[PDB]
Amino acid sequence: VHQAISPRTLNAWVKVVEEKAFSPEVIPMFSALSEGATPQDLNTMLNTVGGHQAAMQMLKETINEEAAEWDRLHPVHAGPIAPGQMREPRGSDIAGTTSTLQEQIGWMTHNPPIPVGEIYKRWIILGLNKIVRMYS
């Protein structure tokens, strides 16, 4: 079932960001609010944050570094993709830039799973830590 992140959860997120100047609490708050999120939902959460450009850029940079690093440890296998099976996720696909919601669930539902939502979420959390470090 595709159940998008609720508007209730987004304004709570916004409220947190609004109310903190990126204080350490925004981290457990983010993980508590992104439970089972697809990359698509994670970006929605992140793009609702406006007006903190310098911090957002630091966060973007961390994701981008981590997506590249994922690519380099996960060499693609060559060949054509057969009906039904899925492509191998790239860094940009993990971050939802190059991938659809269908594909994201595809990867997360798979057995064995490739938990793109949890992977991307680990990278966000690393960005967020750099942010709270700078701003305290």
Partner: protein, 165 residues
């Protein structure tokens, strides 16, 4: 002779299965056709003789040419680096189509696949560059050793290969 003809002699766990011949469309995709020809003759000092089809999905295709790693992450062209997709003029119209296996645009190496069905959805993503002339029933035999995810039940090698005429 503009379009060269090459052959594979296929063996299954060492036992001769049969011959597959291909016409290479040098008149539409010269660079791709030449890569494949020279890798089949062994004239650059490496190429397909002895390699295996690592990925066989019945009703889709048979993939090979990974002569360096044998798994899909290897391969190497004759140009000293991965080469550009030459064009997408030719389509994947049915069984017998010979096309490049790649890992993304402009990543041509030595991997390739032989279609065992119509695979129209591949058009514009893989460079078609030839077609089986003899031995499609040898290709159909190769399909019996594949599976849903491509793993083979026995080792399907190119026991020998070369150019004809």
């Amino acid at each position: 002779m503009v379009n060269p003809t090459v052959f594979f002699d296929i063996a299954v766990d060492g036992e001769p299965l049969g011959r597959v011949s291909f016409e290479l469309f040098a008149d539409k995709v010269p660079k791709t056709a030449e890569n494949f020809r020279a890798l089949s003759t062994g004239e650059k000092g490496f190429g397909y003789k002895g390699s295996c089809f690592h990925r066989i999905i019945p009703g889709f295709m048979c993939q090979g040419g990974d002569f360096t790693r044998h798994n899909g992450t290897g391969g190497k062209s004759i140009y000293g680096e991965k080469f550009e997709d030459e064009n997408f003029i030719l389509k994947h119209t049915g069984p017998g189509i010979l096309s490049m296996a790649n890992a993304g645009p402009n990543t041509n190496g030595s991997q390739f696949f032989i279609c065992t069905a119509k695979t129209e959805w591949l058009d514009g993503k893989h460079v078609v560059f030839g077609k089986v002339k003899e031995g499609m029933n040898i290709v159909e035999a190769m399909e019996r050793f594949g599976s849903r995810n491509g793993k083979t039940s026995k080792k399907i090698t190119i026991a020998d290969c070369g150019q004809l005429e």
